[model samples]
Target: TCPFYKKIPGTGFTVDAFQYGVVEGCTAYFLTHFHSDHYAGLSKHFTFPVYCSEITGNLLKNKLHVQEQYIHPLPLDTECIVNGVKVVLLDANHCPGAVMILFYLPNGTVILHTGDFRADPSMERSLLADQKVHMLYLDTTYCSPEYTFPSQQEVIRFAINTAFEAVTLNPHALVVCGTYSIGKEKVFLAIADVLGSKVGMSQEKYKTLQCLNIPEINSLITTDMCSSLVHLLPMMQINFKGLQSHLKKCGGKYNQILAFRPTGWTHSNKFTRIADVIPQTKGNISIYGIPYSEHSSYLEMKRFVQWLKPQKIIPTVNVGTWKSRSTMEKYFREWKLEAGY
Candidate 1:
């Protein structure tokens, strides 16, 4: 486990050696983004110099509310020395402030760590062709045929359409969604684009998006747009009495509007939960399965691994002993060598 570490209590997270001061003595620790899974653990232990993209640093400081001393921000494509290790940050097509790292050691070793990434041609083309990468730690969260994901554009369209329909059916009904402060900025944009108005966003989410240079969404008229939408708000705000009152006033008969939880969302559980919580509004319920995903789909993962043609391919990030994991191992075994980590 070159980069593995201990699990933190109740956080569903494991702290990396880098987080425990083990890697602090090495050279540098490269952070991919400010997602809780990747960045929150850092706040617990290590306190030496840590390096990451400037955008990522600002996000942690401003959005995640992390202090500054723990972060050492670097610009994209700029080469820097961390305890003698040469590091470069590359853009990752996953979310705002997300990045991939290319590490060049003094020992002539080269490693590429693809943080949570998507295979967007517009974003990945230059990285694949312009860089000389040897070893890769790819994000294979959706590396199975069953794991089909919707495109960003298509997902946005679906959510927008759903929002419009919700408003049309009940002009005063409020729609609420779950979305990460940093991960789902696109969803907010889609809503703003559809409404053709600046959506009001919390200072945190707005600052996060601004730091990442995410395209300006019309202002978010809702709190989810402004603060931590995904973690704090109900998946459907209309069901929450406290939130509904606030949302009902945002739209009218002509504007029938709805909010949508962008990432970490699925129709199966979400629909059932919403129906149960807001039984009276059962008829108003609808679901739109979109192609918004932070990780590569099964097909994309297969293609990337095949492209690398590695001697061994290990499944990770949710590679528990489930049948699906085993099935994935078998599928990839045919291509080269595959195993679960």
Candidate 2:
């Protein structure tokens, strides 16, 4: 569930607050990423002005059709002043064009807003370290202890290795890797990169990928179904009926079918191993769900929270009910921060 938008405590700028109607004193809007949940209410209407990374800005206009003049594209790693606030964009390590926002207010306050991120080693060197961060608006999606998942690299490897083995057994097998509208490009991109497989996807999804500026993606795209062994489809279509319909359309070109459904939600904590599959399969079509998450794991979140040690913490997700919010806050209490001043 998407969290309701809230204005940063001491700033007129609202981050990912487009879902709400004209904010009272907001002078600028910062869209953390191009994901639908974060950009729910963004339309042609440019209430004040919007800011995002170059690629994110491109998608807002080309895909979402936001007005050009009001869309401000900020470069990564550079500070720019917007209404007396020094702001910078850092890679969120979540999806392409996803960014972690940093703000330095006129009152000497330092704030970091991680708009749905996967904590990475890059943050340790790229983000604020010497000085204290006053506030951290965190993405608490997988903050609970049970949500521990494998690294993105591990999931990617699992997907590719699974695909490689699947095809090795039956060279005529159709490889289908499930994807989201955005965020899980690494899985299919790797399928194309490692296996030297041509990836077949809809023209529109290909156009969306074009927005990301992925240089290696050009050669992998193909329209022909028979020649391309690996097929890229949305997560919804990875289902049994959808896969069966697609396989039947092939007219017996493929001997068997293998589908890789990649998402963090597919994971159940019961299986402790990274390579373990749920063993859900019917006949020739096997659906494998990979735990590919862009959000940080529970342990990863702990590292990020303790490293920054922001004075104030804001739980962005699971805040709908006080019960869930407090459940998330309990994890933070055990982090052992310094005594209150």
Candidate 3:
């Protein structure tokens, strides 16, 4: 119900606002990616037509079972018209199927709703954003200085070794990783590849990955549970209770579990040098949290805005509280000033 979910002005369109119900004054609904936080409230029961990347379109149909007629997969980096408004879907780099949605109104003004991004600077000069934006909707999940963390590649590399050394010492340990519906397939693929182990994932997740066509893997995934040492699971299932249930289901072959949990909030600057989060253990289950997030870092967001220099920017994520939105607004202006705006 945040005001950021409101329809874009002068157009009958809503960007990732499905949770608020069939939005008022909206004809075409835009989805940025397949991640539930953005795709929340979308289901088979929903009737509004939607637009997203071709891959996310698969998730909507196969996973959520939305009617085919209502789902529309727009081609990437190409200009198309929706209700007479020009639009484009450019890579957001946040997730596999995620996109930065751009809208160019008939009056030559623009509104760009970035559906969760890691902030690629090139998008500004390369995309129509060079024309400048009338309003910029940003993913402000880590808008504060306190939210800074290491690069995704750095954490991903560390996560591989974190699994390698632990499993090497304890040969029989069952390795499980917390994965998302669309993001961070690279982490699991690397872990399974480096370890030379087959991965067991739910048929649903396996199908989802196939939809993703994650290039680095093929045979690494199998449906059989007992034959594989590594298991890829939903993010919530990486915990003690979830792992314990999995162990019970495994029939005791996996006595010890070395688990990997990946998220943006896992690391803090207090650690100084690149280091793992203090490991948490509960009996036979050992979990390490990897700070491999799809969201942009605080400074990365700063760099993105400083380069874009939009006339008006709106905070999408932290808009729940007015003060939070205000705090984000303060940063937006300072970053604009840094750009000589």
How much lDDT does each candidate structure score?
0.55, 0.81, 0.81
In terms of lDDT, model 2 sits at: 0.81
Winner on lDDT between 1 and 2 is: 2
lDDT of 3 by residue, 69-122 (tens): 999999888999887888999899888888988888877888888888887667
C-alpha RMSD of each candidate structure in angstroms: 6.8, 2.3, 2.4
Badly placed stretches (over 4 Å) of model 2 are 1-5, 337-341
Q: What is the lDDT of residue 287 in candidate 1?
A: 34
lDDT of 3: 0.81
Ten consecutive residues with minimal summed lDDT in candidate 2? 1-10
In order of lDDT, best first, we have 2, 3, 1
The sequence of per-residue lDDT tens digits that candidate 2 reaches over residues 1-341 is 22334576677888888866877778888999999878988887664689899999889888888889989999998878988788889999988999989988788888888998999766888846657788889999988877877777887887778878878878888888887768888888787777777788887787888788777666877777666888888778888899998898888788788888776754474565776664468898888777788888888888878877777788888888888988888878888443222
